[PDB]
Amino acid sequence: GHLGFLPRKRAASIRARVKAFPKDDRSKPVALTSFLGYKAGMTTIVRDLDRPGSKFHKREVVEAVTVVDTPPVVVVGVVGYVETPRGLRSLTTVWAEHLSDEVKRRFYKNWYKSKKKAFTKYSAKYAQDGAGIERELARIKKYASVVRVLVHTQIRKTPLAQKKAHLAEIQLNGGSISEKVDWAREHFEKTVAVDSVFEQNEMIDAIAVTKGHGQRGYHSRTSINHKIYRVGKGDDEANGATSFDRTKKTITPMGGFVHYGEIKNDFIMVKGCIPGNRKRIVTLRKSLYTNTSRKALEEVSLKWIDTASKFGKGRFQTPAEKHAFMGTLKKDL
Amino acid sequence: VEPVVVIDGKGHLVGRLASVVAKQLLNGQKIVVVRAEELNISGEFFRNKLKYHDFLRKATAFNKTRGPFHFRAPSRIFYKALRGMVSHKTARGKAALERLKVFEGIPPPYDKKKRVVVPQALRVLRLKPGRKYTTLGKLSTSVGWKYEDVVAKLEAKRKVSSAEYYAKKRAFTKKVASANATAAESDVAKQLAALGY
RNA sequence: UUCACUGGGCCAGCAUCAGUUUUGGUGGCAGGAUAAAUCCAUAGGAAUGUAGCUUGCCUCGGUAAGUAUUAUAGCCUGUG
RNA sequence: AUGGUGAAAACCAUCUAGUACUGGUUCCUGCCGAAGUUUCCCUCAGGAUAGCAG
RNA sequence: AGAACUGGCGAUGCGGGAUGAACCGAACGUAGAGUUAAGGUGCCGGAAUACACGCUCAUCAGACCAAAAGGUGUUAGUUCAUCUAGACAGCCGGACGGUGGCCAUGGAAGUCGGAAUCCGCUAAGGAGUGUGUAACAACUCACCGGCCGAAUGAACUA
RNA sequence: CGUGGAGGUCAGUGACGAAGCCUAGACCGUAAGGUCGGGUCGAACGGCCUCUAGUGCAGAUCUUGGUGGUAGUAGCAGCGAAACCACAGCCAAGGGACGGGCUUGGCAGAAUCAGCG
RNA sequence: GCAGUCGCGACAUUGCUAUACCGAAGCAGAAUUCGGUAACCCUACUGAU
RNA sequence: GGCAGCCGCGAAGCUACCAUCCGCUGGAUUAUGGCUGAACGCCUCUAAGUCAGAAUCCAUGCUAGAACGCGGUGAUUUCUUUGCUCCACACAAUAUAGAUGGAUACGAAUAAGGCGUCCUUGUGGCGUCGCUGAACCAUAGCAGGCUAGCAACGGUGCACUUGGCGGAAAGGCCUUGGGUGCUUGCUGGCGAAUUGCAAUGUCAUUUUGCGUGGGGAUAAAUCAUUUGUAUACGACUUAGA
């Protein structure tokens, strides 16, 4: 294979980490640089092709897409990074103090025996008049103008057996880092939804860890230039509907995804097959460089979403279809 | 003469500075080099780049990974040049190498202490007027020194309020000199003048 | 048989000594063209021409070019 | 070679410690100490002979 | 490749040469003090980053034989010349009449070509060194005339 | 210098301990070796003037016997080898002929299992 | 190669025997050509404690 | 077909030009074409400078991440018999790539620079400095003692005390107010000896442990099972007061 992807050693951790962040402007408002999710299988999509000058312009096309469950992500702290002649150094980290049992379990390898004393004395600095947090924030304001916010996922909401949350650093693109830290102050302990950052048809890149094949595979990999197709939310009725079919059904196929739970919460649908297997954690960065190609600028209008069963070979699309076709059965009567 | 000697690399010659620092290390004098990125090397920039590349491609034919490592930082380049003038692999050489520290710019607390220079290793004194010369910082940034901007930025930041510190010191020295001058002409001052003080 | 003194063992200093040897200070001698220089005196010579004189001339009487071998500078040669 | 053994590639005891070219050649100290070649028997075989060193 | 003589090796330690039996010195009892050979005095490396006169930017110089020659690289010498009757160069002006010489010929008039290279005037002009027009036309370098100022150009050695 | 035996001597040493051996103990000498300090040992041993030799080991793909890594491996939880072994395993350069321990450089991170490339 | 024209005789001299980027060629366009940037084993190998 | 298979289908693995999604942008450049330009009173892309630009180089991105490079953060053992952590007090060991006053702080250039003064506030006018640091504080008291006054009320050590500055390796500084030693700035009252003519003649710091006192916290990791998103053994990844 290509020497750039060597050596073939196993990935450092299953949770891949972003190694680069989008360029920041000192005038634009605050905006998150990346998000995280869990690959909850894949599906098939059919959509119109309005691309001009194409051999199949105005026609319909079919493709495969990957669904990633992206529940609300809750902030837990903010970190400042100072530039030096020896790279970036973590000058200061200040936490929300509202650390959940999930992050406590993440910090404790054998939680079932741990006394669960993590973050007890430090809570005093926040559960009073304090002003130590204010002093640290002023220190950050005066000092380095690059800030990263620590967040974790609501793993309990996600239908997974891991039950352990994961920490992730996200950069902010807002100028006047005083404003960045002020926004962090008001958003401390808060949860951000998917639709806040990304938008439909936006071009992004994804990073994950590939499935192991026996060493074979099991390495961190990044796939760039992926177009976001949909951003569905649990509170959004009929997340799997479209303008044409407008069927009041969820993206969850008949019997749910194979080797994964029946997703009924926030999720993102993007072009291509993002690396990583089912239940694998992946991260999504927002196009470090503002590509102006027609491929990125074009929009997509979803026509219909495949929802037939994946285990085996799908016989119908929705449960209402099978029983309607059958009419009656001994299993029923 | 001094427990630690701070040497400013700006305007100096790499070879002469390395030789003198190695000699001082072998003699037991602790030396710390500052402003390495501002060091200069005789010869044209193109010639310096060619002579760096011909050595970089000479790393090793048998195993590139096990061959030498091309340190791009000017401080590491100066350290390698000095090590080339020291009997490394020996206990005495290893002990001497611990007495040398090289940092880009003037990191603290060295910034608050006096910095000396070596007259016999200055470009202004060793190079003929009008002759081309190469900048160590430019050479490093050409070969992959990605910290040049930050170095200049924080050096300028230091010089900001270094000017203020100098202004305060100058005012204090002027006041002291005026106080001494108005105290002159006294019997003690005249007696000291006779003895040379 | 009490303790002390002495000869006796390990390391050096002080003063002067004999051999080898390194590096300073200072004095008296014979030779050079009886060193040459430098200095004093005398006749000339010259300009990279000092005083003074003449013709343009801007900066008020300011400067260039001619003259002038010493005058309100000095130099060289020959000689004692 | 002599004397015996068994048998559908021989063996056993003596002459035989039988015929040069490899290999090996054991304590210390002091003094001296070279040579690598002349001569014809022509030489290919081998000594003789002369010099150095006692 | 062959005759032949001298010195090391042989049978040979030591100093320097990154390292090399054949390179230079030096040939050997165990020790101390002092002075040296060859080689060195920026570091590894013990010794001056000594003094004095000049050369070189080499784009892998320099510390180590095919190459005579070229370089609008640099720095010194020899021979010719012209010079305050004006050194080279720079700017402006003349740069002729016969003549459009004869011929190959629709045209080669100075410039597609051949033989000639003719004479007059001068201060000097080639039957023309080139640009170029179908030929003429126009510019022109070399030859001369006016302003600026002084050493310059050529041929060789190194 | 050292050893086996032998001739004369020390009217020699020696159960109150002679040989041999051990001895990170001290002396003698340039040296073969000799002497003494301490532990086991148990019945013989040394200096001096001379004669004698089956008289002194670092190798001989040496002989007799024994012991190491290979190896707790192959093999048939247990039993359990053989071949091989001056001595070990990072490279570039020069060695004007051979570089694996010479020289100049880069560097080397204990120990350890697996697929053969 | 030999010979000859130019005391040793320097060049001339006659006899026989891939793509991409540049300047050009009489490059109208396309295409083409020339000159440049030049394309049961040591060390092991790799996964891993 | 209760024993060993065929027929047709057949997920899930095995696993693909037999399919599926994607596959970077910014500089320094050489070649090359020009600008300003004397050497060579004219020219000239080059010698001083200088514009653009190559499948060239470096950067952005991607993969690994020195297990011997680094920063921040939660928990940090109520029983490892008051155990453990931070300080003050007293004894030892431990050694020191090697104090024997002070590592005494503008920047840029070197065919140029500072310091003082002035107004014309600048590339301004005037004076002066260097020509090395041979430099500046401090340098007297038993290795620095016990005491009395004079003139100043300054200098310095002590814990303190109000604030700011310093994030590059900040871990240090300036001060604001009082108290408490010395003050050799100046003049006095006493011990010094015997170490015998010298033996570094001993005073510094890196850490650790046994003890006393004064503050503080009082939890984790590995194994077993389980688990899978991993498999070649290890490893990796989950759960149960």
Distances (CA, A) of B81 to A139, B37, B41, B92, B97: 40, 14, 12, 18, 12
Instruction: Give how far B63 is from chain A: nearest CA, Å.
Output: 15
Q: What is the resolution of this structure in A?
A: 3.9
Helices (H) and strands (E) counted in chain B, each on its own, are 8, 5
Interchain CB contact of B147 with A (< 8 Å) = yes
Provide the H-helix boundaries in B4-147.
14-27, 45-56, 74-83, 91-97, 123-126, 136-143
The residues with which A44 forms a beta bridge, in sequence order, are: A64
Whether residue B162 is found in the same domain as residue B141: no
Q: Is residue B81 within 8 angstroms of chain A, CB to CB?
A: no
Whether residue A7 has a cis bond before it, omega within 30° of 0? yes
Which residue is closest to H231 in terms of CA–C1' distance?
Answer: A214
Method: cryo-EM
The shortest C-alpha distance from B131 to chain A (Å) reads 31
Burial A129-164 (b: 16+ CB within 10 A, else e): eeeebeebbeebbeebbbbbbbbbbbbeebbbeeeb
Query: Do B108 and B178 lie in a common domain?
Result: no
What distances in angstroms separate CA A292 from CA A225, A287, A295, one per listed residue?
Answer: 12, 11, 8
- Spell out the domain ranges in chain A: 6-71+193-210+217-331, 72-192
A7 touches strand G (CB under 7 A): yes
Inter-axis angle of helices B148-183 and B136-143, nearest 10: 160
Chain F bases under 7 Å from protein CB?
90-92, 105-108
A242 to chain B nearest CA, in Å?
49
Which of A66, A44, A40 is closest to A262 using CA atoms?
Answer: A40
Report d(CA A5, CA A219) in Å as an integer: 9
Name the residue in chain A with its Cα closest to that of B105.
Answer: A85
Beta bridge partners, A171, equal A148
Separation between Cα atoms, residue B133 and residue B137, nearest integer Å: 12
Contact A67, A250 (CB under 8 A): no
In angstroms, the CA A102 to CA A99 distance is 8
> What does the alpha-carbon distance between residue A155 and residue A163 come to, in Å, rounded to a whole number?
6
B61 and B5 assigned to the same domain:
yes
Residues 6+ apart with CB under 8 A from A299: A50, A200, A201
Query: Topology of A72-192 in CATH?
Result: Ribosomal Protein L3; Chain: B; domain 2, (3.30.1430)
B136 and B156 in a single domain? The answer is no
Q: Which residues from B are below 8 Å from A83, CB to CB?
A: 150
Residues B116, B174 within the same domain = no
Of B129, B147, B165, the one marking the end of a domain is: B147
Which CATH code fits A6-71+193-210+217-331? 2.40.30.10
The answer to whether B105 contacts A85, with C-beta atoms less than 8 Å apart, is: yes
Rounded to whole angstroms, how far apart are CA atoms A163 and A158?
9
Q: Kindly identify which residue of chain A lies nearest to residue B155, measuring between CA atoms.
A: A85
- In total, the C-beta contacts within 8 angstroms joining chain A to chain B are 11
Asked if residue B109 has a cis previous peptide bond (ω within 30° of 0), the answer is yes
Backbone angles phi, psi at A11, to 5 degrees: -60, 145
Give strand H nucleotides closer than 7 A to any protein Cβ: 10-12, 14-15, 20-26, 28, 48-49, 58-65, 69-76, 97-99, 102-111, 115-116, 132-133, 165-172, 217-223, 227-232, 236-241
**How many structural domains compose chain B?**
2
Tell which residue, B91, B126, B85, B106, has the closest CA to residue B36: B106
3-state SS of chain A is: CCHHHCCCCCCCCCCCCCCCCCCCCCCCCCCECEEEEEEEEEEEEEEEECCCCCCCCCEEEEEEEEEEECCCEEEEEEEEEEEECCEEEEEEEEECCCCCHHHHHHHCCCCCCCCCCCCCCHHHHHCCCCCHHHHHHHHHHHCCCEEEEEEEECCCCCCCCCCCCCEEEEEECCCCHHHHHHHHHHHCCCEECHHHCCCCCCEEEEEEECCECCCCECCEEEEEEEEEEEEECCCCCCCCCCCCCCCCCCCCCCCCCCCCCCCCCCEEEEEECCCCCCCCEEEEECCCCCCCCHHHHCCCCEEEECCCCCCCCCCCCCHHHHHHHHCCCCCCC
**CATH number of the CATH domain containing B111:** 3.90.1180.10
Same domain, B155 and B194: yes
CATH number, position B177: 1.20.5.4280
**Structural domain of residue B74, as residue ranges?**
1-147
Instruction: State whether B127 and B180 are in the same domain.
Output: no
Task: Kindly determine whether residue B151 and residue A85, on different chains, have CB atoms separated by under 8 Å.
Answer: yes
Nearest to A240 by CA among A91, A54, A43, A95: A43
